[PDB]
Amino acid sequence: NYGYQPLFEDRRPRNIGDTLTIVLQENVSASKSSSANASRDGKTSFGFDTVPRYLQGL
Amino acid sequence: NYGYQPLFEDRRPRNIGDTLTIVLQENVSASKSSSANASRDGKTSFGFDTVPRYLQGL
């Protein structure tokens, strides 16, 4: 003799020892990224090609 | 004489010694992957090509 069993309810596991099907469908995906940058240029110049006489002292 | 046998119920195994057909259909597939990376560059420079006279001491 087994216990009371419902009629219209689905067959769910209810006690220790009942079986149940697992459908393994796992799909995980993670990601990350980053960056950084910096820059600097400089260029100076000056040239007195032909100096007049009254400025030759400087 | 064999025991009571139902009429409309399907032929399921009920006692020790009854036979039952298993349809082996197994298909499992798992996978995983990962990665990582890092990078760094640097480049500095400085050059005094033509130094004026009043700065020659530095």
Mapped to the 3 state alphabet, what secondary structure does chain B carry? CCCCCCCCCCCCCCCCCCCCCCCCCCCCCCCCCCCCCCCCCCCCCCCCCCCCHHHCCC
Structure tokens at B56: 């020659």
User: Do residues B49 and B43 touch, judged by C-beta distance below 8 A?
Assistant: no
Angle (CA) A10-A11-A15 rounded to 5° is 130
User: Do residues B20 and B13 touch, judged by C-beta distance below 8 A?
Assistant: yes
Three-state secondary structure along A24-42?
Answer: CCCCCCCCCCCCCCCCCCC
User: Do residues A13 and A20 touch, judged by C-beta distance below 8 A?
Assistant: yes
Q: Which amino acid is at A33?
A: S
Residues 6+ positions from B28 with CB-CB distance below 8 Å: A24
Three-state SS at A53: helix
Entry resolution in angstroms?
2.8
**Which experimental method was this entry solved with?**
cryo-EM
